[PDB]
Design an enzyme around this catalytic site. Structure first.
Site, short mmCIF file in Angstrom:
data_model
loop_
_atom_site.label_atom_id
_atom_site.label_comp_id
_atom_site.label_asym_id
_atom_site.label_seq_id
_atom_site.Cartn_x
_atom_site.Cartn_y
_atom_site.Cartn_z
N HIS A 1 63.20 -30.89 -28.51
CA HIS A 1 63.67 -29.53 -28.75
C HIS A 1 62.81 -28.44 -28.13
CE1 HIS A 1 60.93 -28.85 -32.34
NE2 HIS A 1 61.04 -27.61 -31.91
N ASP B 1 64.23 -36.09 -32.03
CA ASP B 1 63.39 -35.05 -31.46
C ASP B 1 62.13 -35.71 -30.91
OD1 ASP B 1 62.70 -32.52 -30.77
OD2 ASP B 1 62.19 -31.84 -32.80
N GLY C 1 55.42 -23.49 -33.76
CA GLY C 1 54.40 -23.52 -32.73
C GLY C 1 53.58 -24.81 -32.76
N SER D 1 55.19 -27.76 -33.11
CA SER D 1 56.14 -28.78 -32.66
C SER D 1 55.63 -29.64 -31.51
CB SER D 1 57.46 -28.14 -32.22
OG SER D 1 58.04 -27.37 -33.25
N1 2IN Z 1 56.22 -28.36 -41.85
C1 2IN Z 1 57.02 -27.32 -41.56
N2 2IN Z 1 57.33 -26.64 -42.66
C2 2IN Z 1 57.47 -26.97 -40.27
C3 2IN Z 1 57.23 -27.89 -39.15
C4 2IN Z 1 57.62 -27.58 -37.82
C5 2IN Z 1 58.29 -26.33 -37.56
C6 2IN Z 1 58.68 -26.18 -36.12
N3 2IN Z 1 60.01 -26.41 -35.75
C7 2IN Z 1 60.99 -25.46 -35.81
O1 2IN Z 1 60.88 -24.27 -36.12
C8 2IN Z 1 62.39 -25.96 -35.45
N4 2IN Z 1 63.28 -25.43 -36.46
C9 2IN Z 1 63.37 -25.68 -37.81
O2 2IN Z 1 62.72 -26.49 -38.42
C10 2IN Z 1 64.38 -24.84 -38.56
C11 2IN Z 1 65.67 -25.60 -38.96
O3 2IN Z 1 66.30 -26.50 -38.09
N5 2IN Z 1 64.00 -24.39 -39.88
S1 2IN Z 1 63.24 -22.94 -39.94
O4 2IN Z 1 64.01 -21.92 -39.30
O5 2IN Z 1 63.05 -22.84 -41.38
C12 2IN Z 1 61.58 -22.90 -39.27
C13 2IN Z 1 60.76 -21.66 -39.15
C14 2IN Z 1 61.06 -20.73 -38.05
C15 2IN Z 1 60.28 -19.49 -37.91
C16 2IN Z 1 59.20 -19.19 -38.85
C17 2IN Z 1 58.91 -20.11 -39.97
C18 2IN Z 1 59.69 -21.35 -40.09
C19 2IN Z 1 58.55 -25.36 -38.63
C20 2IN Z 1 58.17 -25.72 -39.98
#
Ligand code: 2IN
Length: 247
Positions: A46, A97, A196, A198
């Site tokens: 992703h 992913d 960030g 990921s």
């Molecule tokens: N352990 C965690 N909580 C976590 C791990 C990795 C991410 C990184 N990946 C992403 O953002 C990809 N998107 C998501 O997980 C989306 C749903 O598919 N959920 S989200 O929008 O709640 C994540 C997010 C985005 C911006 C700021 C805080 C959290 C975020 C949180």
């Protein structure tokens, strides 16, 4: 990383920093990665799905800081970007992913082992740590959900693996989480991975050995109660990993 501690690349020698070049010359951070072999870095699909162009990425090994150099670091171009073909994103869940980045320096060489650059071991077929086991995560991701900037220094923290049964509870993620994913979180919900982080590594000591158990993929919010981090379960992708890293 929400909470946790600041660390240096010396403590996370397999961590790879991935950046993307832009028109003009501005390079921005994209995602974390892990060096699994001299010529290969594993990450999350992703992170690149919207810009499949390999020529625009830059991989750094032996780097402790986001926007400054570190002695010993090495810069790499991406010779080949392998995205998973069954990747898909639902309401929350990100399926398959996982991604492979073959690297090579401008001289056409792969990584050279140093004190700041080493490979991390892959797990064995369906052989993961027991639930409740402590593992670590590293990343340059947000320290707070409300930040719009990333910390300048690398960070790490420790979390525990949650059983698939618990993560599948209604108040957690329900059926969004599958067996190809792993859930982990701090029992007090204080520390966690975040936007960030990921593509970064979820490392667990299995039988006295550091193993790349998972890849940071998704989660609802960051460090929210009953909303664990979800990681791509590396052990279920070994077949996919080997067939793409051969030739
Ligand atoms: N352990 C965690 N909580 C976590 C791990 C990795 C991410 C990184 N990946 C992403 O953002 C990809 N998107 C998501 O997980 C989306 C749903 O598919 N959920 S989200 O929008 O709640 C994540 C997010 C985005 C911006 C700021 C805080 C959290 C975020 C949180």
């Amino acid at each position: 990383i929400i909470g946790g501690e600041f660390t240096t690349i010396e403590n996370q020698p397999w961590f790879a920093a991935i950046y993307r070049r832009h028109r003009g010359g501005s390079v921005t951070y994209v995602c974390g990665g892990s060096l699994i072999s001299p010529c290969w870095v594993i990450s999350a699909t992703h992170c690149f799905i919207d810009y499949p162009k390999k020529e625009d990425y830059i991989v750094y090994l032996g780097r402790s800081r986001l926007n400054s150099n570190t002695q010993g670091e090495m810069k790499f171009e991406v010779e080949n970007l392998i995205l998973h073909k069954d990747y898909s994103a639902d309401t929350l869940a990100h399926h398959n992913d996982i991604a492979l980045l073959k690297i090579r320096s401008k001289e056409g060489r792969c990584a050279q082992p140093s004190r700041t650059i080493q490979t991390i071991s892959l797990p064995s077929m369906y052989n993961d740590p027991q639930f409740g086991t402590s593992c670590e995560i590293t990343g340059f991701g947000k320290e707070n959900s409300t930040d719009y900037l990333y910390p300048e220094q690398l960070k790490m923290t420790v979390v525990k693996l949650i059983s698939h049964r618990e993560c599948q509870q209604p108040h957690y993620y329900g059926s969004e989480v599958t067996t190809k994913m792993l859930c982990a979180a701090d029992p007090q919900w204080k520390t966690d991975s975040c936007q960030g982080d990921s593509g970064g590594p979820l490392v667990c000591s299995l039988q006295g050995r550091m193993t790349l158990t998972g890849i940071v993929s998704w989660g609802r919010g960051c460090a929210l109660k009953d909303k664990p981090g979800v990681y791509t379960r590396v052990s279920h992708f070994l077949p996919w990993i080997r067939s793409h890293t051969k030739e």
